[PDB]
Design a protein around this ligand. Structure first.
Ligand SMILES: CC(C)(COP(=O)(O)OP(=O)(O)OC[C@H]1O[C@@H](n2cnc3c(N)ncnc32)[C@H](O)[C@@H]1OP(=O)(O)O)[C@@H](O)C(=O)NCCC(=O)NCCS
Ligand SMILES: [Cl-]
Ligand SMILES: [Mg+2]
Ligand SMILES: [Zn+2]
Ligand SMILES: [Zn+2]
Lengths: 392, 134, 392, 133
C-alpha cells in the first residue's frame, strides 16, 4: 500500500514468549502499556484507533486487552483482525493505514495469543475434511517437507543443511530474554530429533507458544510532539492474498512471497540487497532457506550457498532471524507478526544488547504468511519495510 | 448418524465407469477461455460456467512427496503423500501406495484406487492414489 | 468516522438464513457473487480490497470465501475482522474507509457464519472463552434476560409487553424469503413458548443461524463507471468500544449504543427523528425496546408507548426491524452486521416486494454490538447511516 | 498429568485458614483511591500499588435470570445474578436456590458452593449468593 504521508513507529512492546499462565488479554495489555510508555504518551486517549490480531482466543480480544487500561469507550474504535499467522502484522498495518490516510495521527497495533492455557483440539489448527488435501491426509509439516525434498532434489541440500537453520536461529537468540528456546544446539541433535514428515524433524518445526507485542505509529508531527528520539520510518508495507490454481508450481519458490516482496521493494524504493536484518516466517527450517531466494536476497537456486557462506548470520549480507525467529520464540498465532516488528525496531535503535546486530542495521524487513487451502501456497502475506528515521 | 457418511471421494474428480471400465481422473475445460481445472462451479479465470469434460491421463509423475510419520488423527502411520503432475499440466495431491524410503522426485506413477481414511461410521473412504509402475 | 470523500454502495448480496449444510465459505461466496453481479462486476480482477467478518469458523475466512472466485492474489489484500456480532458491519466499515481515504476506489465487505454444522444444540452461547462470567456459567440469553428482569422491575412492564417485539418483527418478515422464522404469531404463543432464561422464552431469543451477506462500495466516479442506477450514499458510520467498569451501571440504558448513535447523528447531520427504517441488534425482545430510548427515537420513559402506539411498525415514525430483525433471521455472528445493510439498501431501492416499506424510505440506520466481555454492556458497537444517493 | 483447579479464585475469594468467615476481596489503589477487584494495574490511573479491602458479605440482587438452557456441559436449571455490594462494586455470581423465587433488590449473603465440574470431574468451589433469613 502506498503511504499517503509518512508514518513512523514510536514505542513498541513485547512480552516474554513461551508457556504463560496469564492469558492473551494480560499479555496484550503488558505489550500495549510498554509501547504507549515508550511513546511518551501522557494522555492515553491520544491513541485514536487500535487494531488487535489474534487467531483462536476469542472474538473480542482487543477490547479485552484495552479494557484493563481504562481505554475502552467512545474515543477508541477497536477492530480485531485475523489471517491466521498474518494477524499481528495486519494489526500494525491497519494502524499504519489509519495514520497514513489521515484518519488518525496516532494509532496502535497489538498482536497477542495464549495457546497453552487452552484446550485446542488439533482440528482448530487444520482445515476441515472439506479441503481436498486434508481429505487425503495432508498435514502442514508434510506440505513443507515436500518443499524441502524438492529443494534437496534440485540443489543437493542435505538434512544437515536444513538443520543449520535451527542452529543459526537458536544461536541468534542465545542472549535474547524474550525468546523461549535459545543457545547452542548441535546439528546432530536437530537431525536426530523425532521425524515428523521426512525430512522435517521435530526440532526443525516451530512450536506453539504464548506471547504478545505492540507497535504505536504516528505522523511526523506526532513524533515531534511526543519527543520521540529514534522514530522508525515505515518505508513500506504490503498485504496480499495467495493465488489459487491447480497447475504445477515450483514449490521451491513461493508465489505470494515473491510478489509481496517485489511490491514492497517497488513501493518503498529499497531493494532486497539493502536489507540489513530480516524476520520471516520460519515455521519450518526449509521455509527460511527458500525465502532467501523468494525475497531476492540471492538468486534462484543459490539459497543453499547463501546459507553455507554465512550470508544470513552476523557479518553477512543480511542477518536473518536475529531475534531467533519462530524457531526460538515459538509461534503464538496472533502475536508473531507484531513481535517481528517490535524486535526489528529495537535492533534499528541499537537496544538489543547481547543479541544486537553490529554494525547497527539501518533497513529491517519483516514477513509472515498464514493459512493455505489446497491450490494456494499461503492464504495471506504481510510484509513491512522499516528504516532508521532519525538524523545525525 | 444412521444416514451414512461418504464411502467414496469424489464423483466429479474420479470417474468409476458403471460397466467396469478402468477408472480415470477427469477435469473440466472452460469453453470460453480454455482453462483446464478440476470440477468447479465457475471458471476461476473468466467466471464462465460452460465446460467440457476432459478425461485425464492415468500416468503421472511424482513432483515431490513426503513420508509421514506423525500425521492426521485416525490415519495409520506411516503413510505417504505427494504432488503428482499429469501431462495435461494439472497437479493432483494424493497418497502414494508403498513403503517409506522408496519414492524419489520425478518418479513415474500410475493411478489406483484404495482407502484414504476412515469415515464417521468407521468405514473406509475409497479414493484415488498413485503407485509405482515398476 | 468522518468520510474524507463520498462513498456509495453499489451491489449487495444476501443468502437465505437458517440451518445450512453448506459451510461459511460457500455462504460467503454466494453473497459476495450476488453483490458483485449487482455491481455489474463480471471479472475477478475489479475489486481492489476485501474485508470479511466472522466469529468462530476460521482464521482465514475471507481467503476461503474468495478462493473459488479466482480473486485471491497480489491485487486483492484481504483482511478478516472480529468484534463478536459487530464483525459483519466492521467488514463493510473497513471497505468504506478504504474508499473514503482513496486507498481504493472499489472494495467489498462480507459477513458470513456457519454455526449449526459446528456445534451441538441444547446449549446457549457463553460469554467470552477467557471471561470471568463464563467461569460462573454466563450465557448470552441470561445476560440480556437480566436487562428485561430489571426493566420489568423498574417500569411494571410485563412479559406480554416484551412479547410484542417478536409479534411485530415476525409480522415484518412474513413475506421475506430470507428470514428463518416469520409470519403471524400471538403474544400468547410467544409467552407460552419454553422458558430459556427467565423472562426470555424461546420465541423472544434470536436463533443460532447460518447465513452471509456482502456489500460492494465505491467512489462516486466508480458508481458511474459501473453504471449503478441507485447508489446508496454512506451518510455516516461509527465504531466504538464499550466502557468497562465494575460499578452498578443501569442496564436498562446502554452506554455504548447511546454514545455511538449520538456520534452517528452528529457526523452524518441526520437526527434520530429523520430515520425512516432501522435494523438493530434485536438479539432478544428486550434489546429492541430498550434501544428505542437509547437511540433517541422517543423520549425517556416512552419506549413502551412508542411500541404500543405503532411508531416502530408500518405507518409509524420509524419502521424498526422491517426485514424481521435478528428475531426472524436468527443471528449468524459474523453475518448480521452486513445483512442489515444489504436489506436496508434494498428497502431504499424499493426492491423488497411484499415486505417493502411505504413510502419508500430515504434514510436507513443499522446497529450491531458484540459482547461477552465482563464489565461492558457490549465490547463493541458499529452503526451505519445510509441515504438515497440517486436524484430525481 | 497435572490437575485442574477445584477453587475459584484466591485473588477474589479469601478463605481464612483459621476458619473465619470467607469474604470477597477488593483492592484500593493507593494513588487515586479507586476500589476495584484485583488487577495488575489501576484502570483509572495505571498505578500498581494497592491495599486489599475485605468486602461486605451482604449484597443486593440488582438483577438475575433463571437459566434453563445453559452452557455446554452445565447441569440445569441454574441461576445467576448481578449482586451489588455496599462498596459500589458489582459481582457476577450464581445464586443458590430455586427458579421462580428471586426478586430484584433482594438482600443476599455470600456463600461457598460448586459452580461447575472441572476437567477431572471434581467440583469447582467458588462464591455464590443466597437468600438471608
Ligand atoms: C434460545 C436457544 C437457546 C434455543 O436453542 P435450542 O434450545 O438449542 O434449540 P434447537 O436448536 O435445538 O432447535 C429446536 C427447534 O426450535 C426451533 N428453534 C430453535 N431456536 C429457535 C429460536 N431462537 N426461535 C424460534 N425457534 C427456534 C428450531 O427450528 C428447531 O427445530 P428444527 O429441528 O426443525 O430445526 C438458542 O436459540 C439461543 O441461544 N439463542 C440466543 C443466541 C445468542 O445468544 N446469540 C448472541 C446474541 S448477542
Ligand atoms: Cl452483545
Ligand atoms: Mg487520556
Ligand atoms: Zn474460463
Ligand atoms: Zn489508581
Amino acid at each position: 500500500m502506498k503511504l499517503q504521508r509518512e508514518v513512523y513507529i514510536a514505542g513498541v512492546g513485547e512480552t516474554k514468549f513461551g508457556k504463560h499462565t496469564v492469558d492473551f488479554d494480560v499479555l496484550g495489555r503488558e505489550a500495549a502499556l510498554q509501547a504507549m510508555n515508550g511513546s511518551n504518551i501522557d494522555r492515553p486517549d491520544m491513541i485514536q484507533s487500535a487494531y488487535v490480531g489474534n487467531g483462536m482466543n476469542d472474538m473480542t480480544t482487543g477490547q479485552a486487552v484495552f479494557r484493563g487500561l481504562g481505554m475502552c469507550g467512545p474515543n477508541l474504535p477497536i477492530i480485531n483482525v485475523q489471517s491466521a499467522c498474518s494477524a499481528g502484522a495486519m494489526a500494525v498495518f491497519c494502524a499504519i493505514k489509519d495514520v497514513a490516510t489521515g484518519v488518525t495521527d496516532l494509532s496502535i497495533g497489538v498482536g497477542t495469543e495464549n495457546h497453552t492455557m487452552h484446550r485446542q483440539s488439533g482440528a482448530a489448527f487444520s482445515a476441515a475434511r472439506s479441503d481436498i488435501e486434508t481429505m487425503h491426509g495432508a498435514v502442514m509439516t508434510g506440505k513443507y517437507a515436500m518443499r524441502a525434498t524438492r529443494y534437496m532434489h534440485e540443489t543437493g541440500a542435505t538434512i544437515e543443511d536444513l538443520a543449520m537453520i535451527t542452529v543459526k536461529n537458536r544461536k541468534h537468540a542465545t542472549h535474547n530474554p524474550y525468546a523461549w528456546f535459545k543457545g547452542a544446539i548441535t546439528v546432530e541433535e536437530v537431525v536426530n530429533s523425532r521425524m515428523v514428515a521426512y525430512p522435517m524433524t521435530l526440532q526443525q518445526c516451530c512450536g506453539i507458544a504464548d506471547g504478545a507485542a505492540a507497535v504505536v505509529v504516528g505522523s511526523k508531527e506526532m513524533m515531534k510532539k511526543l519527543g520521540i528520539a529514534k522514530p522508525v520510518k515505515v518505508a513500506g508495507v504490503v498485504v496480499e492474498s495467495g493465488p489459487y490454481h491447480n497447475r504445477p508450481r515450483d514449490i521451491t519458490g513461493d508465489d505470494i512471497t515473491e510478489t509481496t516482496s517485489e511490491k514492497l521493494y517497488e513501493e518503498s524504493g529499497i531493494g532486497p540487497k539493502e536489507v540489513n536484518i530480516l524476520e520471516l516466517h520460519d515455521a519450518f527450517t526449509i521455509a527460511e532457506l527458500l525465502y532467501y531466494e523468494c525475497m531476492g536476497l540471492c538468486k534462484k537456486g543459490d539459497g543453499l550457498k547463501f546459507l553455507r557462506d554465512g550470508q544470513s548470520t552476523y557479518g553477512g549480507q543480511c542477518v536473518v532471524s536475529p531475534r531467533g525467529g519462530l524457531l526460538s520464540y515459538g509461534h503464538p498465532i496472533g502475536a508473531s507478526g507484531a513481535a517481528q516488528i517490535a524486535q526489528n525496531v529495537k535492533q534499528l535503535r541499537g537496544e538489543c544488547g547481547g543479541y544486537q546486530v553490529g554494525p547497527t542495521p539501518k533497513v529491517a524487513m519483516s514477513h509472515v504468511t498464514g493459512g493455505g487451502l489446497s491450490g494456494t501456497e499461503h492464504a495471506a502475506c504481510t510484509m513491512h519495510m522499516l528504516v532508521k528515521g532519525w538524523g545525525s | 448418524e444412521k444416514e451414512p457418511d461418504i464411502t467414496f471421494f469424489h464423483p466429479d474428480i474420479l470417474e468409476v465407469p458403471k460397466d467396469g471400465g478402468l477408472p480415470y481422473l477427469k477435469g473440466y475445460r472452460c469453453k470460453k477461455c480454455g482453462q483446464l481445472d478440476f470440477k468447479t462451479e465457475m471458471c476461476t479465470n473468466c467466471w464462465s460456467e460452460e465446460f467440457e469434460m476432459v478425461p485425464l491421463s492415468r500416468r503421472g509423475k511424482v513432483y515431490s512427496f513426503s513420508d509421514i510419520y506423525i500425521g492426521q488423527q485416525g490415519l495409520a502411520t506411516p503413510y505417504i503423500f505427494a504432488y503428482v503432475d499429469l501431462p495435461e499440466n494439472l497437479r493432483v495431491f494424493a497418497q502414494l501406495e508403498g513403503e517409506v524410503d522408496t519414492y524419489r522426485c520425478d518418479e513415474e506413477v500410475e493411478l489406483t484406487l484404495g482407502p484414504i481414511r476412515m469415515n464417521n461410521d468407521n468405514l473406509p473412504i475409497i479414493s484415488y492414489k498413485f503407485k509405482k509402475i515398476a
